């Protein structure tokens, strides 16, 4: 069980009033995440209750409770004697503007004023700002660089307003949480089609836009590209591929790819595979395509685990 | 835990009224620092409470409490019988005008009246005032020197007013606490880019301003400058660099840098590295750039610890 699940069980088992009181001490993101997780709860078993309660007790003893509300206590002490969460939120927004993809952030801030872009990048990590600037056009990127070189500081109010606007934009994006609609999704769809319709769609997209089809082609693994994969990954792949499946799949493979597979096998196994290829009769194209699809699925599984580099 | 953290825990665990009473006996800087630290408190564990309480007891016994409020007691005694914190604040401001960077202080007091500049530098340390004067133009620097040579003393009221104005300027600067926007920040950003965009940005900045690009270049470590680093630092670097990583990185390095690395290795290891360089095939530029980036990260880590001089 994740910590979110344990927290959800704890909130469900303490009563509605207590859970509501706890929500008053949690941030908006945490409350939203817990409410979303509480929505999908269908059953909580005996272990999921007892272990969660014991872990909650051990955690309450871990930091020994205490920690009176910092904001109210600090305000009362300052008032009686005589930043804070706003500074923490600005720091979090600085963190939020570094974990995103460089392309997404660049597109988000592409239309902003060059001084605004420079101000944002100053507070960002060096690598993230470097990647974002690499995606801008020459003129805008160099203008932002020059403005950074002469950055004179920003008043806290303007920085806070910019942070609030960026937080609103991020909230809108997260509410959208745009489902993958780029060339990668189409390539995944295209890879699972039959060869006929796959090639027809690729050719038609190239007819409409050669660049778009090439982008989809670059994002798809339609077999016959294992020749460009390193020898170590191919050797790792051969340990998970059945000999008969490899034999059937390599029947329709090009001689370069066939030699690429043979070079990564043991010499005895390579000779056996060559003899089987020379002796086995014609194989229906559908079976070869199915075997190649299975090999591609194995390749994807290995790549997801980090054992294979594509 | 730092002393600030222990003080914050102590203030949180004594109650709001007691903490407010304690704040009345603390300076503005200390109160602001504690309030900022109290803002980020999320939990205080059992050890963080018990050890802090025990240390507070041992500290209260260390100076044996006592020390009635000096200002009120002194005022009452003087009134009944018949400088102080103002003098202490002026001394602190004198200290504050010596821990700053010479460039920052020089820019702060560049536009001031030459007599004011001379008066400020008289109360400063010899080295700090020497460094500040080195950054002024010939005419202004020599005028300030001549005014120092004929410095006749300043009334306490004028010195106090100047100290108050300087304290206000310092408070404004600390509220700003200008995030690093000079050529160093851009150089750090530029060093983490890919070679293409890094070189393009450098060339474009030189097109706009050759001096600015040179300043950014002088503040960046884009590899290939390890030839200018001392032999001892290179030898220290080789102890932390993997042999294969060094071999890949040196594949795209210039012959001068390659000989610089080879001269700092043992003769057997140097021969092995030469043979590997001569025998290993072509390496993709991206991998070489990644290895050089890793070596630069190791160099930065060593420099931060003082084991390497750049």
């Amino acid at each position: 069980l994740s910590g979110t699940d344990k927290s959800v069980i704890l909130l469900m088992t303490i009563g509605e009033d207590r859970a509501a009181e706890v929500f008053k001490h949690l941030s908006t993101r945490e409350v939203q995440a817990l409410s979303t997780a509480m929505a999908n709860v269908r059953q909580i078993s005996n272990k999921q209750l007892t272990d969660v309660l014991s872990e909650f007790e051990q955690e309450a003893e871990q930091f020994a409770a205490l920690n009176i509300n910092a904001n109210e206590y600090l305000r009362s002490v300052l008032v009686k004697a005589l930043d804070i969460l706003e500074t923490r939120d600005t720091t979090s927004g600085i963190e939020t503007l570094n974990f995103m993809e460089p392309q997404s952030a660049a597109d988000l801030i592409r239309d902003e004023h060059p001084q605004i872009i420079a101000t944002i990048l100053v507070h960002l990590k060096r690598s993230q700002a470097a990647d974002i600037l690499a995606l801008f056009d020459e003129r805008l990127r160099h203008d932002v660089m020059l403005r950074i070189a002469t950055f004179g500081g920003v008043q806290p109010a303007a920085l806070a307003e910019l942070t609030e606007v960026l937080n609103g934009l991020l909230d809108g994006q997260n509410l959208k949480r745009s489902k993958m609609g780029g060339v990668r999704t189409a390539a995944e769809i295209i890879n699972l089609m039959k060869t006929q319709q796959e090639e027809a769609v690729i050719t038609a997209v190239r007819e409409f836009d050669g660049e778009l089809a090439q982008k989809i082609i670059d994002e798809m693994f339609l077999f016959e590209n294992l020749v460009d994969v390193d020898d170590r990954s191919i050797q790792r792949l051969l340990q998970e591929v059945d000999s008969e499946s490899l034999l059937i799949a390599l029947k329709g493979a090009e001689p370069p790819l066939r030699e690429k597979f043979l070079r990564n096998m043991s010499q005895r196994a390579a000779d056996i595979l060559r003899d089987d290829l020379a002796n086995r009769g014609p194989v229906r194209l559908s079976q070869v395509e199915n075997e190649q699809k299975a090999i591609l699925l194995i390749v994807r599984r290995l790549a997801e685990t980090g054992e294979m580099v594509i | 835990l730092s002393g600030t953290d222990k003080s914050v825990i102590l203030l949180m665990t004594i109650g709001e009224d007691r903490a407010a009473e304690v704040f009345k006996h603390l300076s503005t800087r200390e109160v602001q620092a504690l309030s900022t630290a109290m803002a980020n408190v999320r939990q205080i564990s059992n050890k963080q409470l018990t050890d802090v309480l025990s240390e507070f007891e041992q500290e209260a016994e260390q100076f044996a409490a006592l020390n009635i409020n000096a200002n009120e007691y002194l005022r009452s005694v003087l009134v009944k019988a018949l400088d102080i914190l103002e003098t202490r604040d002026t001394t602190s401001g004198i200290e504050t005008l010596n821990f700053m960077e010479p460039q920052s202080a020089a820019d702060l007091i560049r536009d001031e009246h030459p007599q004011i500049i001379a008066t400020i530098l008289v109360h400063l340390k010899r080295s700090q005032a020497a460094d500040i004067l080195a950054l002024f133009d010939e005419r202004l620097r020599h005028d300030v020197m001549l005014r120092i040579a004929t410095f006749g003393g300043v009334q306490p009221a004028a010195l106090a007013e100047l100290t108050e104005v300087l304290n206000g300027l310092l408070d404004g600067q600390n509220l700003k606490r200008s995030k690093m926007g000079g050529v160093r920040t851009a150089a750090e950003i530029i060093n983490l880019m890919k070679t293409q965009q890094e070189e393009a940005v450098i060339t474009a900045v030189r097109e706009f301003d050759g001096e600015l690009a040179q300043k950014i270049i002088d503040e960046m470590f884009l590899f290939e400058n390890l030839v200018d680093v001392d032999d001892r630092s290179i030898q220290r670097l080789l102890q932390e660099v993997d042999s294969e990583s060094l071999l890949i990185a040196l594949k795209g390095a210039e012959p001068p840098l390659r000989e610089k690395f080879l001269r700092n290795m043992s003769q057997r290891a140097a021969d092995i590295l030469r043979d590997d360089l001569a025998n290993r095939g072509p390496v993709r530029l991206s991998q070489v750039e990644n290895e050089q980036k890793a070596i630069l990260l190791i160099v930065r880590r060593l420099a931060e610890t003082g084991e390497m001089v750049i």
């Binding site: 994740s2 910590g3 979110t4 344990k6 927290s7 704890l10 909130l11 088992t13 303490i14 009563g15 207590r18 009181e21 706890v22 008053k24 001490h25 949690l26 945490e30 995440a33 817990l34 309660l53 014991s54 909650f56 007790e57 955690e59 309450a60 930091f63 409770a65 920690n67 009176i68 509300n69 | 999320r42 939990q43």
Partner: peptide
Amino acid sequence: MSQRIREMSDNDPRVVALVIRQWMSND
């Protein structure tokens, strides 16, 4: 369901919030 449920119900809501925050951070 021993007395531990009742004991946990009497804990400060801030303590529960901090435990929840730590659990979510550990994810």
